[PDB]
Amino acid sequence: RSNSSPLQQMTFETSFQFLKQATMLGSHDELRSPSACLVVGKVVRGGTGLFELKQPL
Amino acid sequence: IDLKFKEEVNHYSNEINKACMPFGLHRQFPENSLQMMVQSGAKGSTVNTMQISCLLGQIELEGRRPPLMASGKSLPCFEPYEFTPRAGGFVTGRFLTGIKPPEFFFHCMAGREGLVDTAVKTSRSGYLQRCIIKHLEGLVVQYDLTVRDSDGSVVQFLYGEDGLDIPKTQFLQPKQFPFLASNYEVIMKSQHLHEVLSRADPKKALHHFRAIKKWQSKHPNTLLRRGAF
Amino acid sequence: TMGFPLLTYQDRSDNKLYRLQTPQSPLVRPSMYDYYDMDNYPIGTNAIVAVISYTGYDMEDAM
Amino acid sequence: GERKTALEMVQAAGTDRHCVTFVLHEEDHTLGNSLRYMIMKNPEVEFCGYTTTHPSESKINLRIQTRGTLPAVEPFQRGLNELMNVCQHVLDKFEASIKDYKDQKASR
Amino acid sequence: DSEMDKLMMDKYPGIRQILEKKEGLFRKHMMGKRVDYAARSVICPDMYINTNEIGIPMVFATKLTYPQPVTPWNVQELRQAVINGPNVHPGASMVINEDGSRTALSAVDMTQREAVAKQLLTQGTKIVCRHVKNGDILLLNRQPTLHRPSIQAHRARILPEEKVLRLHYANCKAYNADFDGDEMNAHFPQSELGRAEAYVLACTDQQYLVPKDGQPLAGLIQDHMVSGASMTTRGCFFTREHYMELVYRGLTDKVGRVKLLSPSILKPFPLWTGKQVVSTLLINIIPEDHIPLNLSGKAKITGKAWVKETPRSVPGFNPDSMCESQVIIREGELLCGVLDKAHYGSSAYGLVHCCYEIYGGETSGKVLTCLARLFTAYLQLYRGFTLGVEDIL
Amino acid sequence: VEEMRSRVVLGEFGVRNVHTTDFPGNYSGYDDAWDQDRFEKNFRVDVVHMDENSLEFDMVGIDAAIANAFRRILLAEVPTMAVEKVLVYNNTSIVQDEILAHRLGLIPIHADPRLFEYRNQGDEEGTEIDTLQFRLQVRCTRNPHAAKDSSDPNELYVNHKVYTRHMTWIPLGNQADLFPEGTIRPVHDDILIAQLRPGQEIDLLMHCVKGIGKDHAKFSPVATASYRLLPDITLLEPVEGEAAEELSRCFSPGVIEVQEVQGKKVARVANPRLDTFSREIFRNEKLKKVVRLARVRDHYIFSVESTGVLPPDVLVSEAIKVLMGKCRRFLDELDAV
Amino acid sequence: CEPGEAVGLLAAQSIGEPSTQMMNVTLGIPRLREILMVASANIKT
Amino acid sequence: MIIPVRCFTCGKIVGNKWEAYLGLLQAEYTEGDALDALGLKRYCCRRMLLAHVDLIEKLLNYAP
Amino acid sequence: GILFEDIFDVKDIDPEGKKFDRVSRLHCESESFKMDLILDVNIQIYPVDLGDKFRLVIASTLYEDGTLDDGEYNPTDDRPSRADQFEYVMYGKVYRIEGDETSTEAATRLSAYVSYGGLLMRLQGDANNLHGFEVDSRVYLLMKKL
Amino acid sequence: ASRHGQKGILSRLWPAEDMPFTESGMVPDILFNPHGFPSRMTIGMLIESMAGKSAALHGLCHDATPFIFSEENSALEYFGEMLKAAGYNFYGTERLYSGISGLELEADIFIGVVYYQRLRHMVSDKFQVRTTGARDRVTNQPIGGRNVQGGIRFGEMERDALLAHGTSFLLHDRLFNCSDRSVAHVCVKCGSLLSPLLEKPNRKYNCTLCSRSDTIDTVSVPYVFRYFVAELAAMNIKVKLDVV
RNA sequence: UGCUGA
DNA sequence: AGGACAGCGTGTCAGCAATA
Ligand SMILES: [Mg+2]
Ligand SMILES: [Zn+2]
Ligand SMILES: [Zn+2]
């Protein structure tokens, strides 16, 4: 409950209570957890994905 | 009573294992094939080697001897409230010369509780691990060596309280320096090389440790309430 | 075990039915195996087994 | 004749003629082991060893490392010849013995 | 919510049940999707493929396809693959066009595949969906995945006529595989950016140490421990021809001369020691430029296991100064010690753990492979291991 | 300072060594460079038994590598003829079609494989050069001339049991000449192929091709071709006085012949070759110290038993020639560069 | 400890694997669940 | 079902000693003496006949 | 090229009780030097008994004419004057030299440990005559009974 | 499997000329590693081998009834006497040769006759490979089973190990590209997946909620992500997503 | 839902 | 404010038949 990720926290347990909460509070998700990053099809923010590559022109 | 009974029986087994297993075997360790398989770590144990020869042991189901019936007998073959250790699951037979029917029964009880416990234990462990993994998953080491969560909350300011991930700290223990010293030429050529050793400048950290050492020299008892006044 | 399940093929129309071609009767078997004739329906074959570590492919439960 | 059921030679690092690895195809431990026994009798070879590369495949690798002078392809071609000479002698001796025994038994 | 109302019937599950449970939609189809380009089959012991390799049985290899782009430096080998066809092994099932897509070669007329072997290099280049090509990287997983070492990357050694995926026995304890019917999954990266990570990060030699306590995970098992303990014992003497053919059969060396040793006994008959076989196998594996390692430790077999007869008091002798319990490798040459599980095994600070520290994880894998082969040749050629009834008696 | 040049000594808890000390540099003076004349002088073959389908020559004075090469040639490289394809026109038997084909492949044919040749890859048809065809066509009928009896041969029997006698050779090409009438036939006329009941029929054509016992056992020409090193038994002490008989019972019975030199009984080692290694003296605890049993170094004993396709001596000759052919193939491929 | 290590997942799996596989106090997974998963003020012993 | 044609370990042909074996057992001979009189020396062959169960005689009893 | 030569006599055939198969550990003791020798010897090739003498030599070369050894084994060598007055020749390396324990005493005795593949030897005695040794040094152990 | 719980897959078919032949000419047909005994203590297999070898030798048939052989009358004594009465050795070990080197192995091997059963589980019934195939319509994911192409559920336990290695891209490639990778459109200004619209046949997307047609742009997303936006709307809940 | 495999 | 209590929870891993 003391967690800043609605997409996490609903991939764990009691997903409908945590969805009702996140919905009646307008709770915003930053897509920084591994779960929130695998739900919307992003690259996790640890290990190999932690930096850019920035090909110079 | 159960506990103070699995004791006279255990005195006789010690006397029984010692009689046969070390030197009562027909062939000894260099030339025995069972020893030299449990003794070199290939497969098995001295308690498997025994329990194949000279004793099977005291059966224990829930940490206790086999349960009694509602009339006070542990098995239809045994009088009610029979004192012999045999009636309580003390198997003196070995797999070399098989075990009798009553001992077979207790051994099956034990072997079956083992499987039941395996199933239930795994059922609980899976859930424990799922919960743990679902909470500590976003903690990664950052480029400032601090262990932060997904939202930036600093959990630790240094991973192990010193950094130093586990697999690499195996030879940094003492008692492994006489190895790094013996293999110094290979270690410098193969990894660090003369290049890194001379591209190192230790003054800032070395002076800090000198200051710490001087302080600890002037204050042997570091719990003595230092103060100006 | 794949064995000899019955004598009446052409008649059963089951779903699966595993049959072993040339079963044998154990040369070492309990006497009760002979009270309920279980050789009307054999289950395996006798093999010459050597207990030896020779190949490098028979370790950890493989044969 | 056969481009690969037979010999493929891999000269070592630096193509050392004195260290060669012959690949013999369609061969198992029979020829491998007899030829290694016949090549070990040459005092001019310092290391001879054969090995099967993998069970699924049908091929062996001989490794001959000779001394400083000879190109390690003479030891191979001489072990072959000595093994074939031994086989010819064994064949002659065995046929003569069989004939002699047949006569001794048919007479009596 | 199917169960908000308990007094109605003909009630099929609502959305709370479509989303929220182990069946659910998050713990399934969200975190546990099903994957393409993956195989699953029973695993079999190999031992004659290097520790970093998996054996693929030519039925996955002909179906698993990697979609590689056509460029000036590969258009030759890709051309052979499109010519070999969908069913011959170094072949290809399809070729994707620059703007169009999916012109399948699976025909077996052998002429249209040649009609399309041209026009390769004839925007985004044509991509040939080639088969697995004996050097590819594959992720292998056993299903109770309880640690990081349960998924490791392997190097696609293709084997003909089988339906089993063959894996070295050093990689057993990592997976907990037991060769008693042990299905295992093999995933085929398809991006060329997950291949770089399977090579660098998920590789199976970066996985030598368990992350729980840093102690080694890969090691030899069973009869590679009873073989090495009975060869490295003090009274094992080998003639020149059993010394050789035991060194070369552990090495199978492909690059460079095999550097040998001198007989320990030179006179009544030249004879070697078995510790010398392991020595000479150790000085060939260690990389040419690097120098052999020094190592001092203890053996698993206690120095008391050998005491047949009561020990008598020697006035000036510390029995442990010269015992088979102390392992002493001095410049890559084993001088004392049995080298049981304490080395070659899953125990820390042994010979292979120090090899992995000083010279890297590929050299420790090489040492494991070569030592397995040597200890197999020994039991298969000159000695034998069995377990009768006169050793349990 | 004690040399033992000729025997593989042995106790109970294991054998002493695995060497033979007859190679280059294996001694101070006893060095070797493969003296061919020394071989041709120390080699001798002695043929003990030679019934038909048996041979037991000795092959004294050869290494284990060459003996093993000969043994592995007989088991897996000497060529034989055997059924490879089966065309089944009808088969109303209890025995399946695939099982019948299998059973037919394992039947030995008396054609000599040296007059034939290997079918080229994809040569489905075959020709007089590489194939032999045989036909089994049998039908079971009740015999009209039978009483109310139950012996299966008397009634319910024209062809109750299908044997190898029922297989007939169909001369494929000009093979009727070259092969006289009885020469190409199955080796055994009594092998039970199947069993039939009235109204049941077998009808098939079998094709026999050449091949070696290496790609399938059906093509293998010997039951077994193993060898064993000649045992050696030495009485370190004169055994006598009713311990001689206990000694004579701890061995295969012919090995220790108990003579009666004086009033007392002396045991003597009459024939060491009969001994089977059973190591039953080592259980005696008083005579394990009296006898030393080992093996002669390079003195073998072979035993070849053919199935019936070729005689055993011809089998051994063709094995030696197959090894020579391997060597010559590799010599001539080396000369190709 | 290279930057990006994701050490929390390693801690999770290192506490999990040993338990999943494997006197007047509590032992085993009961105690681990009392400590980690429940954080109870009431413990059995 | 029916007698194997060749012994599995060796390859010796035992498919022609079934009826002879049955005939020597009807004459009063033990299974040991019978297997000896047929030439089955090594026990790998002796197990091939000693433990054979002829189930072709029980399948050949249901209607055509 | 000799580093040590002496005439020993076997005192104990295997005191520790560890018994290997073809190897026997002799505990000898020099004469006229009172040096000590522990020696693992392959007794299947070279039987040794109690109360037996033997002349023992340690060398760094077998040529006894100065030329160093090349570290390569040729059974085909054409220089055949290498020491052959000796029945049992070994070849190992010294892996440990340790001055004796006694402090406050002269105690200038050294124990040199040599390994011969797997057959260890220990030579203990006055340092004055064990100077030729040094760790990692290859040495031949020639022996000849008397 | 044997009659004593000693199961095991068939790993090799060893050539008949590479098998260790015995001094009697025989050659085993099953090779059983001797390391299954020490931890499993199936001493009944070691007695069945000797009993069956004695049976095959003497033409007998011994019984293996439990509780018929005591400590005083042992089974090993009985069957070793039977063997020694046939010319073999008490302890049941006959010495073999190496079929590969041709030398008599130093150890004498324990050989005998045991009764093997063949189990009903074959690799031919338990092997699966899926590439592409029935994509489940509700989630656009591989179908499963073995009868169709049948995919392998990845699972929540496995993604955790793949990210421990820090191989984010392998975990990205696998899930997104081998599973539901879709290419949806969003009202970038209003952040709704549901809003973008296609004209009946140019087919330029136009937002239904706000009439702007040039705001719409594509975003890579899964189908179960779209399925979840649909399910959440089936309740009046709104998922407003911020496009960048 | 009854089975089965690790 | 001492309770009484009603209320949610999870639960390793893949196959087959078959049938709602
Ligand atoms: Mg298993
Ligand atoms: Zn046989
Ligand atoms: Zn809008």
Swiss-Prot record, chain D:
Cellular location(s): Nucleus; Nucleus, Nucleolus
Function, in words: DNA-dependent RNA polymerase catalyzes the transcription of DNA into RNA using the four ribonucleoside triphosphates as substrates. Common component of RNA polymerases I and III which synthesize ribosomal RNA precursors and short non-coding RNAs including 5S rRNA, snRNAs, tRNAs and miRNAs, respectively.
This protein's record includes keyword Cytoplasm: no
GO molecular function: DNA binding; DNA-directed RNA polymerase activity; protein dimerization activity
Keyword Isomerase in annotation: no
Gene Ontology CC terms, in alphabetical order: RNA polymerase I complex; RNA polymerase III complex
Family classification: Belongs to the archaeal Rpo11/eukaryotic RPB11/RPC19 RNA polymerase subunit family.
Quaternary structure annotation from Swiss-Prot or TrEMBL: Component of the RNA polymerase I and RNA polymerase III complexes consisting of at least 13 and 17 subunits, respectively. Pol I complex consists of a ten-subunit catalytic core composed of POLR1A/RPA1, POLR1B/RPA2, POLR1C/RPAC1, POLR1D/RPAC2, POLR1H/RPA12, POLR2E/RPABC1, POLR2F/RPABC2, POLR2H/RPABC3, POLR2K/RPABC4 and POLR2L/RPABC5; a mobile stalk subunit POLR1F/RPA43 protruding from the core and additional subunits homologous to general transcription factors POLR1E/RPA49 and POLR1G/RPA34.
Keywords, in A-Z order: Acetylation, Disease variant, DNA-directed RNA polymerase, Nucleus, Transcription
Span within the parent record: 21 to 128 of 133
Gene Ontology biological-process entries: transcription by RNA polymerase III; transcription elongation by RNA polymerase I
Principal location class: nucleus
Superkingdom classification of source: Eukaryota
UniProtKB/Swiss-Prot annotation, chain G:
Subunit record text: Component of the RNA polymerase I (Pol I) complex consisting of 13 subunits: a ten-subunit catalytic core composed of POLR1A/RPA1, POLR1B/RPA2, POLR1C/RPAC1, POLR1D/RPAC2, POLR1H/RPA12, POLR2E/RPABC1, POLR2F/RPABC2, POLR2H/RPABC3, POLR2K/RPABC4 and POLR2L/RPABC5; a mobile stalk subunit POLR1F/RPA43 protruding from the core and additional subunits homologous to general transcription factors POLR1E/RPA49 and POLR1G/RPA34. Part of Pol I pre-initiation complex (PIC), in which Pol I core assembles with RRN3 and promoter-bound UTBF and SL1/TIF-IB complex.
Trigger loop: region residues: 3-32
Binding site for DNA template strand: 33
Interval of the full protein contained in this chain: 1205 to 1261 of 1720
Family recorded in the similarity comment: Belongs to the RNA polymerase beta' chain family.
Task performed by this protein: Catalytic core component of RNA polymerase I (Pol I), a DNA-dependent RNA polymerase which synthesizes ribosomal RNA precursors using the four ribonucleoside triphosphates as substrates. Transcribes 47S pre-rRNAs from multicopy rRNA gene clusters, giving rise to 5.8S, 18S and 28S ribosomal RNAs. Pol I-mediated transcription cycle proceeds through transcription initiation, transcription elongation and transcription termination stages.
Free-text note regarding domains: The clamps form the DNA-binding cleft.
Location within or outside the cell: Nucleus, Nucleolus; Chromosome
Name recorded for this polypeptide: DNA-directed RNA polymerase I subunit RPA1
UniProt source species: Homo sapiens (Human)
Curated annotation (Swiss-Prot), chain H:
Signal peptide positions on this chain: none
One Gene Ontology cellular component annotation held by this UniProt entry: nucleus
Domain of life: Eukaryota
Principal cellular location given in the protein's record: nucleus
InterPro entries: RNA_pol_su_RPB10, RNA_pol_suN_Zn-BS, RPABC5/Rpb10
Gene Ontology terms for molecular function: DNA binding; DNA-directed RNA polymerase activity; zinc ion binding
GO terms for biological process, alphabetical: regulation of transcription by RNA polymerase I; transcription by RNA polymerase I; transcription by RNA polymerase II; tRNA transcription by RNA polymerase III
Binding of Zn(2+), residues: 7, 10, 44-45
SUPFAM superfamilies the record matches: RNA polymerase subunit RPB10 (SSF46924)
One Pfam family in the UniProt entry: RNA_pol_N
UniProt keyword list: DNA-directed RNA polymerase, Metal-binding, Nucleus, Transcription, Zinc
Subcellular location(s) of the protein: Nucleus; Nucleus, Nucleolus
Subunit record text: Component of the RNA polymerase I (Pol I), RNA polymerase II (Pol II) and RNA polymerase III (Pol III) complexes consisting of at least 13, 12 and 17 subunits, respectively. Pol I complex consists of a ten-subunit catalytic core composed of POLR1A/RPA1, POLR1B/RPA2, POLR1C/RPAC1, POLR1D/RPAC2, POLR1H/RPA12, POLR2E/RPABC1, POLR2F/RPABC2, POLR2H/RPABC3, POLR2K/RPABC4 and POLR2L/RPABC5; a mobile stalk subunit POLR1F/RPA43 protruding from the core and additional subunits homologous to general transcription factors POLR1E/RPA49 and POLR1G/RPA34.
PANTHER family registered for this protein in UniProt: DNA-DIRECTED RNA POLYMERASES I, II, AND III SUBUNIT RPABC5, DNA-DIRECTED RNA POLYMERASES I, II, AND III SUBUNIT RPABC5 FAMILY MEMBER
Membership in a protein family: Belongs to the archaeal Rpo10/eukaryotic RPB10 RNA polymerase subunit family.
Organism field: Homo sapiens (Human)
UniProtKB/Swiss-Prot annotation, chain I:
Key word Transcription present: yes
Start and end residues of each stretch annotated as Non-specific ssDNA binding: 14-38
Keyword terms, alphabetized: Acetylation, DNA-binding, DNA-directed RNA polymerase, Nucleus, Transcription
Single GO MF descriptor: DNA-directed RNA polymerase activity
One GO location term (cellular component): cytosol
Subcellular location, record wording: Nucleus; Nucleus, Nucleolus
Main location: nucleus
SUPFAM superfamilies: Nucleic acid-binding proteins
Single Gene Ontology BP annotation: transcription by RNA polymerase II
Function summary: DNA-dependent RNA polymerase catalyzes the transcription of DNA into RNA using the four ribonucleoside triphosphates as substrates. Common component of RNA polymerases I, II and III which synthesize ribosomal RNA precursors, mRNA precursors and many functional non-coding RNAs, and small RNAs, such as 5S rRNA and tRNAs, respectively.
Family: Belongs to the eukaryotic RPB8 RNA polymerase subunit family.
Subunit structure: Component of the RNA polymerase I (Pol I), RNA polymerase II (Pol II) and RNA polymerase III (Pol III) complexes consisting of at least 13, 12 and 17 subunits, respectively. Pol I complex consists of a ten-subunit catalytic core composed of POLR1A/RPA1, POLR1B/RPA2, POLR1C/RPAC1, POLR1D/RPAC2, POLR1H/RPA12, POLR2E/RPABC1, POLR2F/RPABC2, POLR2H/RPABC3, POLR2K/RPABC4 and POLR2L/RPABC5; a mobile stalk subunit POLR1F/RPA43 protruding from the core and additional subunits homologous to general transcription factors POLR1E/RPA49 and POLR1G/RPA34.
Name of this protein: DNA-directed RNA polymerases I, II, and III subunit RPABC3
Organism field: Homo sapiens (Human)
Gene that encodes the chain: POLR2H
